[model samples]
Target: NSNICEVCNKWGRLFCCDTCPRSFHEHCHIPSVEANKNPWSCIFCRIKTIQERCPESQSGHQESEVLMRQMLPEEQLKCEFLLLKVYCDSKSCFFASEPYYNREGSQGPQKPMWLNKVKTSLNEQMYTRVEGFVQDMRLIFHNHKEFYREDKFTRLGIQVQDIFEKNFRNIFAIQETS
Candidate 1:
């Protein structure tokens, strides 16, 4: 009965996904979760409907079927698109310029994460699996929340994360099955 919100690791009036163990607070999840919906599915568990489809034609159904350890070009392209979404947002330059990365003194995270660095990692094929890339993206958001607690940056970070995960699931067509 003790479970934390997967997004923030906090206890609250959570909405649990029927298809996955992950839970979220109303505001913690993208599109905000509705508790009244039975058989509710999390972002990671839901199937991408035709209306939910992006402008892109490719779907990651094949990767969903296999236990893929390698990061394919399809995954790389998906990542690129995710990055583009963040970059295109005017308020997101704070994340892209990476103020903490090149800032003087010992004021930032020891191992700072930035959009360019993540993009570089993707281009260099540094991620062995899609999970690694996903982890790194989350780390960027995590760092923002930690470094700027309860601040505007933190709010923006959460919003950016929502954009990333929602698209990430759509791009990958992730449907976690029990």
Candidate 2:
């Protein structure tokens, strides 16, 4: 339960800017956002602030630089592809008991929403269903792992705590470097 909508000025469940107090009804928010997806800024408060933010002024505003990145389509695709494999293969680790590193607490071995994105886009595009996703995505995984850095990912097994950043870097790396 959150505060009244700042946009509609009516009391109801709403989305609040993580940084500012301003809030909005789900529909009232410009560039409306889902309840628990990416953090969003209030439109009234934005007032062109993103354009004003520059590297010279970003020492304290790290997300400004984070908001910008350059990556080729294939490079971006590979990152998304590999990590989904990691995430899929790491299910047991993510939902294991006794808090450790990124897997703190019981999340259950259920698949994450991210796997959906990889379905048609990754394996489906790489091979026909006749091939069956049977090999647990390993077929394409092996091919693509060699696609970069002379196989920087020598060990493909899921070491949750150890490779949490490895997975994260892929997520972020998929975005930048241009």
Candidate 3:
């Protein structure tokens, strides 16, 4: 019987990425081997294998890194702001005790309670908006769908810029005199 990799159509013992199932022949692989000392595995497979072998080291770190890489700096900042806004809004009593609240006992001031509720609501709204923008970026990156010849990073950057510009316009429109 002929020993050839079915996927690559190359003549040699079959090998496959350990991480993925993609198969290739000896010469077709990155590190070619004339003969297999052990069952061949692909790079992706190798990574997975190593990760499995060292569960402690791989725990949560890979997933966190992936999420971090997916988040843009502006989006991250927006998320942080949203969290702070939530904390301020939901915990008015706690917030009022903080140093930022200059008029601690003032009664005439728009009730801190109301302000907190409003802030919480607005934070949720902004969170949704930023999440949608990030999702759009992810779709563009995953699909490799660029508007022009630009790479995934460039395309995502352009999309993020558009989202930011739209947000700025919406924010300033109320103040615009027209």
lDDT: which candidate is best?
1
What clash count goes with each model? 0, 0, 7
Q: lDDT of all predictions, in order shown? A: 0.65, 0.40, 0.37
Model 3 per-residue lDDT at 175: 34
| lDDT for model 2 | 0.40
Where's the lowest-lDDT run of ten residues in candidate 1? 46-55
List the candidate 3 regions with Cα displacement exceeding 4 Å. 1-22, 34-36, 39-45, 62-178
TM-score of each: 0.55, 0.26, 0.24
- Model 3 worst lDDT window (10 residues): 90-99
Residue-level lDDT tens digits of model 2 in 1-178: 2476653457877777765786667654533445565667654344325325433332332323433433344333433333433443434232222322222332322222222333444433553331222233333333323332243442342233234334443433323343
Q: Which candidate comes out best when scored by TM-score? A: 1
Off by over 4 Å in 2: 54-178
Worst 10 residues of 2 by lDDT: 94-103
Candidate 3, RMSD to the unseen true structure: 23.0
- Pick by lDDT: 1 or 3, better one: 1
Query: Which ranges in model 1 have alpha carbons more than 4 Å from their true place?
Result: 1-68, 101-107, 176-178
Candidates ranked, most accurate by lDDT first: 1, 2, 3
The Cα error of candidate 3 at residue 24, in Å, is 1.4
